[PDB]
Structure 1
Amino acid sequence: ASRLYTLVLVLQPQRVLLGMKKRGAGAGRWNGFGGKVQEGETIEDGARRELQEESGLTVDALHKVGQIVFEFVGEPELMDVHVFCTDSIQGTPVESDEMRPCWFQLDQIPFKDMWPDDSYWFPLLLQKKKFHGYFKFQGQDTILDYTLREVDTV
C-alpha cells in the first residue's frame, strides 16, 4: 500500500536549487520540488508538472536518480518517492505563497534545515550515483531505521 510521489533536484555543476516550503507537509525545510502523481499521468510527467508548479521552471528531459520509500509510524500509506535530476532548465525560479526557491553552492547545502534522510542520499546524488532507499520515520524529525543502496537501474 504505497502512493506515488516525485521529487526533482535541479543540479548544476556548482549549485543546486532547493525550495523552502511555506505550508503543509515539510514546511520550514528546504527540499526538492515534487508532489503526488495524478490519475492518467506518468511519473515523469508528474515530476515535470510539479517542478513548474512549485518553482516556475520548465524542464525537458528528467533523469531518474533514485527511489525512496518512506514509512511514517502510525500512518497506513507508504510514500513511494521517485527522485529525478536535471541540469537544463528554462525560466527563472519563482517565489510563491507556497514555496521560496534558492540556489545553494554544493558545499553550503543546508542539511540541518532539510529532511534528515537527505543527509544520506544527497551525497550520492552529488556524485551522480543512483539509489534505492527506505526510511522509517517517527514524526518528521526521527529516523528509526533505514536502508540505502546504490543501484545501476532505478
Structure 2
Amino acid sequence: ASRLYTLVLVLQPQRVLLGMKKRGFGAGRWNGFGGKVQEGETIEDGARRELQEESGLTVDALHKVGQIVFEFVGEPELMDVHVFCTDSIQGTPVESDEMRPCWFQLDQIPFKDMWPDNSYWFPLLLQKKKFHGYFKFQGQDTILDYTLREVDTV
C-alpha cells in the first residue's frame, strides 16, 4: 500500500542545502535529497546512499526527524517518506546533470519554488522539533487536506 522513501536535509546553524532536480518527479523545484529504499537496505542506509548519489556529500551522523505520508489522488501508492537531518557532512556538493545543489540562508528558504508541503513542516524542522504528517495532493501543486503533529519519537 505504501512505498518507502527517504528525504535528507543538510541543516547547519545558518544555512540549509537544497537541490533542484533537472528532470523527473520534482523537476524545477528545490528539495532535500532522497529516493526509494532498496531491498535488504535499512531506511537509514538508504538515506545515506541517496544523499551521496544526489548531492555528492558523505554524511557522518544522521538523525530521524519526521515521517510524512503523501497521497496523490488517482495514484495507488502512498509515499511513506522518512525525513532525516544532519549537520555533520564531508565533501563539497556536486552539481551533476541530474541535480543542482545550493546553500540557502535560513531566512531565504525558497518556499515558492519548493513542494507546497514544505512550508508546513520546515518551521518544525528549523526549531529542532520532530513530526508525523500526512498530505493529500491533487496533482503536484494543490494540497487538498493534511495533518501534521509534533512527536517525541519518530
Equivalent-residue separation in structure 1 for 2:120 and 2:133 (angstroms): 9
Q: Deviations over 1:76-130 (max 9, x none)?
A: 0000000000001000000001100000000000000000000000010000000
Equivalent-residue separation in structure 1 for 2:138 and 2:21 (angstroms): 20
SS of equivalent residue, structure 2 residue 143: strand
1:36 equivalent in structure 2: 36
- Map 1:1-154; keep pairs closer than 5 Å: 1-154=1-154
State, as a whole percentage, how many aligned pairs show the same letter.
99
Moved over 3 A (4+): none
Deviation at 1:142, TM superposition (A): 0.1
* Aligned CA-pair RMSD: 0.3
Equivalent-residue separation in structure 2 for 1:43 and 1:60 (angstroms): 15
Equivalent-residue separation in structure 2 for 1:90 and 1:20 (angstroms): 20
TM normalised by structure 2 equals: 1.00
SS of equivalent residue, structure 1 residue 36: coil
Deviation at 1:61, TM superposition (A): 1.7
Q: Deviations over 1:11-60 (max 9, x none)?
A: 00000000001100000000000000000000000000000000000002
Q: Structure 2 unaligned segments of length 5 or more: list them.
A: none
